[PDB]
Amino acid sequence: ITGTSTVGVGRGVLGDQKNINTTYSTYYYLQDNTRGNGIFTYDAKYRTTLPGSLWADADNQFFASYDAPAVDAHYYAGVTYDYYKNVHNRLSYDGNNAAIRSSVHYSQGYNNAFWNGSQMVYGDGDGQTFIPLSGGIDVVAHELTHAVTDYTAGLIYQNESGAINEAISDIFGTLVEFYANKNPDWEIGEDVYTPGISGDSLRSMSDPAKYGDPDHYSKRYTGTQDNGGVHINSGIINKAAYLISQGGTHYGVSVVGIGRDKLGKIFYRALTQYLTPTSNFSQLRAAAVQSATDLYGSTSQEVASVKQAFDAVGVK
Ligand SMILES: CC(C)C[C@H](NP(=O)(O)CNC(=O)OCc1ccccc1)C(=O)N[C@@H](CN)C(=O)O
Ligand SMILES: [Ca+2]
Ligand SMILES: [Ca+2]
Ligand SMILES: [Ca+2]
Ligand SMILES: [Ca+2]
Ligand SMILES: [Zn+2]
């Protein structure tokens, strides 16, 4: 909408106060004009029609329980935009500052979040498996990263290419979580998963097997559920990424860690310069080796560690 840029205040899903960029024109809208061609947050009103209505508020204060998922979707989309711009010199998901749109309060009891080809969508959860999913910064960044992937490598959402697609979203979700630097970890979705169980998460990158996901290519899932295991076999790549950054010895193979920043540079370059819609795990290894070679040189530690990490998870 046309209006003037304003700054509202509200509370997110976890009860924390934050400022949010809004737009005033009769109402205050969840429309942040400070980033690209805008970040826009919508109310889906417990229905499945999308996007719903652009979020309107009478007083620019967002402290109601119903407001909390909108506050976080809007704010964390801003953090994710900032990460891509400041760290990777990428302007929104398409590289040309496309408007970023999210809808909250999608459906009833909906235990998921997704990119639908055009926008982000967040359920409220059923209060048992999830609370409103925009409360997780890693979740928000996971979803926006699907849009980045779709505009760049275009990884098809099935089998190995789809597991890479998933891992890319977990990797950058985690790197955005570290960028914001509030309780960062290598776990996925811990802030909104299972409110009655402490200390768990939907996936672990540091130890995928903690939740039954494979941590070695020889343990990959080969069936048809979950688009050929895209959220399962992602553990193999997540583990490799974790090892590149943090190091470790895994199935007897030692990896010297090179840190998060270099992990992000290597995988961002792989995603945007080398991967294709049908890339498999072996081709991802080759893309990461080439990317590290471009950035750091063929004889570098960074290249050697990429090779070590993929060896550790059984990907040649
Ligand atoms: C980080 C997480 C809390 C949320 C994450 N959602 P996502 O990967 O973005 C789910 N996208 C999808 O299906 O795209 C495919 C698609 C959907 C709609 C239109 C086009 C394409 C996830 O890990 N979900 C699991 C939750 N057991 C799942 O969906 O199995
Ligand atoms: Ca209000
Ligand atoms: Ca965390
Ligand atoms: Ca996390
Ligand atoms: Ca939990
Ligand atoms: Zn995903």
Side-chain angles (χ1 to χ4, degrees), residues 177 183-185 190-191:
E177 186 174 306
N183 299 312
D185 52 56
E190 68 284 344
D191 290 336

Side-chain angles (χ1 to χ4, degrees), residues 8-20 62-65 67-73 75-76 79 131-132 134-137 180-181 183 191-192:
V9 188
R11 182 179 305 127
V13 173
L14 297 189
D16 51 326
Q17 188 174 299
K18 59 203 73 185
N19 294 338
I20 51 265
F62 298 82
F63 293 91
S65 301
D67 301 340
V71 169
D72 280 344
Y75 183 92
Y76 294 142
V79 177
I131 64 175
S134 59
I137 186 168
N181 198 27
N183 299 312
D191 290 336
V192 292

Side-chain angles (χ1 to χ4, degrees), residues 183-205:
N183 299 312
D185 52 56
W186 293 89
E187 306 292 296
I188 305 300
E190 68 284 344
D191 290 336
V192 292
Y193 191 62
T194 59
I197 303 166
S198 64
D200 67 344
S201 63
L202 179 64
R203 288 178 287 277
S204 172
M205 302 181 68

